Write an enzyme that holds these catalytic residues in place. Structure first.
Site, PDB file in Angstrom:
ATOM      1  N   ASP A 198       0.831  -1.215   0.000  1.00 54.68           N
ATOM      2  CA  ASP A 198       0.000   0.000   0.000  1.00 54.68           C
ATOM      3  C   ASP A 198       0.871   1.274   0.000  1.00 54.68           C
ATOM      4  O   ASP A 198       0.632   2.201   0.775  1.00 54.68           O
ATOM      5  CB  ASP A 198      -0.982  -0.013   1.199  1.00 54.68           C
ATOM      6  CG  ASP A 198      -2.118   0.995   1.123  1.00 54.68           C
ATOM      7  OD1 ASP A 198      -2.563   1.309  -0.004  1.00 54.68           O
ATOM      8  OD2 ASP A 198      -2.590   1.439   2.193  1.00 54.68           O
ATOM      9  N   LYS A 237       1.909   4.775  -1.111  1.00 53.13           N
ATOM     10  CA  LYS A 237       1.299   5.973  -1.692  1.00 53.13           C
ATOM     11  C   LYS A 237       1.662   7.210  -0.848  1.00 53.13           C
ATOM     12  O   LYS A 237       1.978   7.050   0.333  1.00 53.13           O
ATOM     13  CB  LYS A 237      -0.230   5.812  -1.815  1.00 53.13           C
ATOM     14  CG  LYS A 237      -0.956   5.538  -0.503  1.00 53.13           C
ATOM     15  CD  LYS A 237      -2.417   5.174  -0.750  1.00 53.13           C
ATOM     16  CE  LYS A 237      -3.323   5.433   0.432  1.00 53.13           C
ATOM     17  NZ  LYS A 237      -4.267   4.315   0.677  1.00 53.13           N
ATOM     18  N   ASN A 248       0.071   7.719   2.862  1.00 52.35           N
ATOM     19  CA  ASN A 248       0.601   6.967   4.008  1.00 52.35           C
ATOM     20  C   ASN A 248       2.056   7.359   4.365  1.00 52.35           C
ATOM     21  O   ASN A 248       2.755   6.564   4.996  1.00 52.35           O
ATOM     22  CB  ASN A 248       0.515   5.456   3.725  1.00 52.35           C
ATOM     23  CG  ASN A 248      -0.889   4.948   3.509  1.00 52.35           C
ATOM     24  OD1 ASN A 248      -1.879   5.591   3.875  1.00 52.35           O
ATOM     25  ND2 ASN A 248      -1.006   3.754   2.950  1.00 52.35           N
ATOM     26  N   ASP A 257       1.436   3.606   7.712  1.00 49.12           N
ATOM     27  CA  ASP A 257       0.360   2.603   7.675  1.00 49.12           C
ATOM     28  C   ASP A 257       0.871   1.194   7.360  1.00 49.12           C
ATOM     29  O   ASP A 257       1.232   0.932   6.216  1.00 49.12           O
ATOM     30  CB  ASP A 257      -0.713   3.011   6.649  1.00 49.12           C
ATOM     31  CG  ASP A 257      -1.902   2.073   6.609  1.00 49.12           C
ATOM     32  OD1 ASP A 257      -2.682   2.063   7.586  1.00 49.12           O
ATOM     33  OD2 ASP A 257      -2.042   1.337   5.608  1.00 49.12           O
ATOM     34  N   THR A 274      -4.441  -0.054  -2.612  1.00 46.29           N
ATOM     35  CA  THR A 274      -5.241   0.985  -3.262  1.00 46.29           C
ATOM     36  C   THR A 274      -5.279   0.686  -4.773  1.00 46.29           C
ATOM     37  O   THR A 274      -4.221   0.457  -5.360  1.00 46.29           O
ATOM     38  CB  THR A 274      -4.662   2.367  -2.936  1.00 46.29           C
ATOM     39  OG1 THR A 274      -4.549   2.494  -1.518  1.00 46.29           O
ATOM     40  CG2 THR A 274      -5.516   3.506  -3.476  1.00 46.29           C
TER      41      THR A 274
HETATM   42  C1  LIG Z   1      -3.726   9.206   6.176  1.00 46.15           C
HETATM   43  N1  LIG Z   1      -3.433  10.497   6.795  1.00 46.15           N
HETATM   44  C2  LIG Z   1      -3.918  11.574   5.940  1.00 46.15           C
HETATM   45  C3  LIG Z   1      -4.047  10.587   8.125  1.00 46.15           C
HETATM   46  C4  LIG Z   1      -3.040  10.254   9.194  1.00 46.15           C
HETATM   47  C5  LIG Z   1      -2.205  11.309   9.763  1.00 46.15           C
HETATM   48  C6  LIG Z   1      -1.289  11.037  10.713  1.00 46.15           C
HETATM   49  N2  LIG Z   1      -1.131   9.733  11.156  1.00 46.15           N
HETATM   50  C7  LIG Z   1      -0.266   9.181  12.100  1.00 46.15           C
HETATM   51  C8  LIG Z   1       0.830   9.890  12.796  1.00 46.15           C
HETATM   52  C9  LIG Z   1       2.016   9.244  13.132  1.00 46.15           C
HETATM   53  C10 LIG Z   1       2.977  10.004  13.768  1.00 46.15           C
HETATM   54  N3  LIG Z   1       2.821  11.307  14.046  1.00 46.15           N
HETATM   55  C11 LIG Z   1       1.640  11.855  13.662  1.00 46.15           C
HETATM   56  N4  LIG Z   1       1.489  13.169  13.841  1.00 46.15           N
HETATM   57  N5  LIG Z   1       0.622  11.190  13.058  1.00 46.15           N
HETATM   58  C12 LIG Z   1      -0.601   7.834  12.146  1.00 46.15           C
HETATM   59  C13 LIG Z   1      -0.095   6.744  13.010  1.00 46.15           C
HETATM   60  C14 LIG Z   1       0.236   5.505  12.457  1.00 46.15           C
HETATM   61  C15 LIG Z   1       0.605   4.443  13.266  1.00 46.15           C
HETATM   62  C16 LIG Z   1       0.642   4.641  14.622  1.00 46.15           C
HETATM   63  F1  LIG Z   1       0.926   3.581  15.424  1.00 46.15           F
HETATM   64  C17 LIG Z   1       0.357   5.848  15.210  1.00 46.15           C
HETATM   65  C18 LIG Z   1      -0.020   6.903  14.395  1.00 46.15           C
HETATM   66  N6  LIG Z   1      -1.610   7.538  11.239  1.00 46.15           N
HETATM   67  C19 LIG Z   1      -1.914   8.694  10.656  1.00 46.15           C
HETATM   68  C20 LIG Z   1      -2.879   8.990   9.654  1.00 46.15           C
END
Ligand SMILES: CN(C)Cc1ccn2c(-c3ccnc(N)n3)c(-c3ccc(F)cc3)nc2c1
Length: 802
Positions: free
Chosen positions: A643, A645, A648, A661, A678
């Site tokens: 995935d 992109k 992520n 992700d 995706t």
């Molecule tokens: C797809 N994006 C548009 C939305 C988005 C935004 C931030 N994160 C984190 C994120 C990660 C770190 N700092 C911070 N600040 N945001 C994480 C994340 C992923 C795995 C974890 F265990 C903890 C946090 N996932 C997202 C998804």
């Protein structure tokens, strides 16, 4: 009478009513093969593969005025009309009338989707249908049983004996199943062929000079020397009955593995060299250079290969075939057989005079490594200093602190190491004091103690006190000298600080702090919500004042989608990841699930490319290069992301990427067949359902490079329907805009967006080296990227969140 019972507990049910048994006649199989050739996923399959799929098709009997398909309901079947007529109605209005030969519900085979229009039987007719589960399972079996059959034949062949498991699995994918009818010549005597044939099923006859020599059954093969050298065929092989043969071509082998004699000799020499303790610490690239420049000579029995005077700069000797008897003056000191070797003292002491004498017992083949062969390998004439430099490099390169530093910074730190002796019972480190040195044991044993209690022991090549280079904290445990006069290589904090620069030091400073903080749920104060899906929240640790990011995966969401085992494997992947461009996990809680990670404040890569617009060559190199190292790290640990992109990927305060992700990610062990990811970034082999590996992320890498350079997606940008996105990925044409003026960008994008994974760049034995050494990255410094020494394209003014 006992005082101490338990009770017991869409489209498939509708088609089950119309189901009926029928014998598959020759006329019925012909129309199925014809209609399946026009299909999107069965076009790439051969006649034997389509003949198997025709047998699993079930016959369904319908009457005049019966509903077949429903609009809005899930699509699991794909039908081929046999008799009668079926009218297609969209939004309670007629659209088209079908008949024998046509088909419908093509998208149901690739993925579960809601149908647009309804299909009702106008006249009394019958259909030939197949379900998604049955269809995808048949493709998986045809691909898996073919690969396992081919791999068993690759093992039976003798020229591929010294290839590794990864090398054997790569040449198995290069096999092409060639069919031969009775009385058809497979190969002719005298012709200069370049193919290796193995009998899968059937019989073939041999003919040397038009005279029958023998008959070949299943398992027999011919053409080993054709893959190695340009020689004519010794016989004419003709098929007696309808045979099927797995064929490996030399042209396809050169794309996947290269020169087979070079790959086989590299494995032979690596195995022989790894027996010695000196060459055990040498890198794979260094051991391959020695094999590529080693002098291979054949000798008769009772011949002095090496004598005190007649050495001719030889420092190491490996026996490839036969036997040699080692001697010192006139006293025998050993007998080396095939695979064994000698010379450790002369390799370590370049100027030492050769005192030994090597003499052959029988006819042998010997490989020799001279001082010039070692000098060109190590890249320096001082072999004694370079081996010691590599020994230190091998220890520090396995540690996170020095792994990602630039080679210039790493070499200065190695050159700065100083040796120092410690008598019996001398305290190297004393708990409570603020240390300023990092240590590596050269010779001896040391005991680790805390409050007069032995925790553990450390010996040769082990290390300690690396935290003193990043902080001014007190020492936790004392290191006492257990053995007599122990030598220790050491480097001061002052020296380390002069070599390392601000950005990397900041990255190491705040990252290594996370493992010491003991985090429970009760002290984490929630500041604000930053993500949503399943939700991410910004949390503040009150005792340490360090800010973190906390995911909140709902238990009801995992139970509804049936992801009870997948969430457990996601925890295993995310926790083991320790790379500067991958998110670092701290701790996971449960009661719903949680994931505490480092706070990434620089924003999203998705928004960064929107702020920059169409990326230039230096900007596209940086982001793709940062993705390449994170994906290479996962591929080295046998993990496929599935995935990739810009959505992520986040950016840190310094402007460097962070992959996050790992829901679709999986630990691969062979070939995966589950359709995930995706649609716009998915690879054709995932959609075709004939097995896939780590190569799917290299396709998505090309899709990311296309968005960066060109702007829109390469396949199905304006399209929203999954079928049309998947159709553009398989049958569509890859085009580039007129504003793209760089050849190297297009050449890399076309090679990364190559439908066949065998011919795709970075999917050969060399791996990412092919992508890294491409003309697109000619001026790009890969050492400065990992070491945080390049100026990034965009830097966040403060903090940014979605
Ligand atoms: C797809 N994006 C548009 C939305 C988005 C935004 C931030 N994160 C984190 C994120 C990660 C770190 N700092 C911070 N600040 N945001 C994480 C994340 C992923 C795995 C974890 F265990 C903890 C946090 N996932 C997202 C998804």
């Amino acid at each position: 009478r006992c005082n101490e019972k338990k009770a017991i507990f869409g489209e498939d049910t509708l088609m089950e009513d119309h189901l009926q048994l029928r014998e598959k006649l020759s006329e019925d199989i012909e129309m199925i093969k014809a209609s399946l050739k026009n299909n999107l996923v069965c076009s790439t399959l051969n006649d034997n593969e389509i003949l198997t799929l025709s047998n699993y098709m079930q016959f369904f009997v319908f009457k005049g005025g019966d509903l077949v398909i429903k609009q809005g309901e899930k699509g699991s079947y794909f039908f081929i009309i046999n008799s009668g007529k079926f009218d297609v109605y969209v939004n309670d209005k007629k659209v088209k009338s079908m008949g024998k030969g046509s088909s419908f519900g093509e998208a149901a085979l690739i993925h579960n989707t809601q149908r647009s229009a309804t299909i009702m039987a106008e006249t009394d007719g019958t259909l030939w249908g197949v379900q998604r589960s049955t269809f995808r399972a048949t493709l998986k079996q045809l691909s898996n049983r073919n690969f396992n059959e081919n791999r068993s034949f690759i093992d039976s062949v003798s020229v591929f004996d010294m290839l590794t498991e990864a090398q054997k699995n790569m040449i198995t994918n290069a096999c092409v199943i060639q069919m031969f009818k009775p009385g058809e010549t497979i190969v002719k005597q005298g012709d200069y062929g370049d193919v290796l044939f193995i009998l899968k099923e059937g019989k073939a006859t041999v003919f040397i000079n038009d005279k029958e020599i023998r008959v070949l059954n299943k398992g027999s093969y011919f053409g080993e020397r054709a893959l190695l050298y340009d020689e004519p065929r010794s016989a004419t092989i003709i098929a007696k009955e309808p045979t099927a043969c797995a064929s490996i071509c030399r042209k396809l082998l050169n794309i996947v593995l290269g020169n087979l004699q070079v790959v086989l000799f590299r494995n032979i020499m690596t195995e022989a060299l790894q027996q010695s303790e000196i060459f055990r610490q040498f890198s794979a690239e260094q051991l391959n250079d020695l094999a590529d420049t080693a002098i291979v000579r054949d000798y008769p029995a009772n011949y002095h290969i090496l004598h005190k005077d007649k050495v001719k700069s030889v420092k190491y000797l490996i026996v490839l075939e036969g036997k040699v008897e080692l001697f010192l003056d006139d006293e025998s000191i050993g007998i080396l057989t095939r695979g064994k070797s000698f010379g450790d003292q002369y390799v370590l002491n370049q100027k030492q005079k050769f005192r030994h004498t090597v003499k052959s017992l029988d006819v042998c083949k010997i490989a020799l490594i001279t001082e010039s062969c070692l000098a060109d390998c190590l890249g320096d004439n001082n072999i004694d200093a370079s081996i010691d430099h590599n020994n230190k490099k091998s220890i520090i390169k396995k540690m996170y602190i020095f792994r990602y530093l630039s080679e210039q910074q790493c070499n200065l730190l190695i050159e700065a190491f100083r040796t120092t002796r410690y008598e019996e019972g001398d305290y190297i480190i004393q708990e409570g004091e603020v240390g300023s040195r990092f240590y590596i044991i050269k010779n001896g044993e040391v005991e680790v103690t805390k409050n007069g209690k032995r925790l553990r022991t450390l010996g040769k090549n082990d290390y300690f006190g690396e935290r003193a280079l990043l902080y001014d904290e007190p020492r936790t445990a004392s290191i006492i000298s257990k053995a007599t006069s122990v030598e220790c290589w050491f480097v001061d904090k002052s020296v380390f600080l002069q070599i390392i620069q601000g950005p990397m030091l900041t990255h190491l400073e705040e990252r290594i702090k996370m493992q010491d903080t003991k985090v429970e749920m009760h002290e984490l104060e929630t500041e604000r919500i930053i993500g949503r899906g399943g939700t991410v929240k910004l949390v503040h640790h009150k005792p340490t004042q360090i800010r973190y990011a906390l995911k909140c995966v709902s238990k009801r969401s995992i139970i509804s989608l049936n992801q009870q085992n997948n969430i457990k494997l996601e925890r295993e992947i995310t926790a083991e990841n320790d790379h500067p461009f991958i998110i670092r996990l701290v701790r996971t809680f449960k009661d719903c699930f949680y994931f505490l990670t480092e706070l990434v404040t620089g924003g999203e890569l998705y928004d960064a490319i929107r702020k920059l617009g169409l990326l230039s060559k230096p900007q596209a190199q940086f982001y793709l290069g940062s993705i390449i190292l994170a994906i290479e790290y996962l591929h080295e640990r046998n993990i496929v992301y599935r995935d990739l992109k810009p959505e992520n990927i986040l950016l840190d305060k310094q402007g460097y990427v962070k992959l996050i992700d790992f829901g679709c990610a999986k630990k691969i062990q062979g070939r995966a067949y589950t359709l995930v990811g995706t649609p716009h970034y998915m690879a054709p082999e995932v959609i075709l359902g004939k097995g896939y590996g780590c190569t799917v992320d290299i396709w998505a890498l090309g899709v990311c490079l296309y968005e960066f350079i060109c702007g829109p997606l390469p396949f199905g940008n304006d399209q929203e329907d999954q079928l049309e996105i998947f159709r553009d990925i398989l049958t569509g044409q890859l085009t580039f805009p007129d504003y793209v003026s760089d050849q190297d960008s297009i050449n890399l994008m076309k090679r990364l967006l190559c439908r066949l994974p065998q011919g795709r760049i970075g999917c050969s034995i060399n791996g990412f080296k092919d992508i890294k050494e491409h003309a697109f990255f000619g001026n790009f410094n890969w050492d400065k990227l990992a070491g945080r020494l390049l100026e990034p394209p965009l830097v966040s003014k403060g903090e940014t969140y979605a």
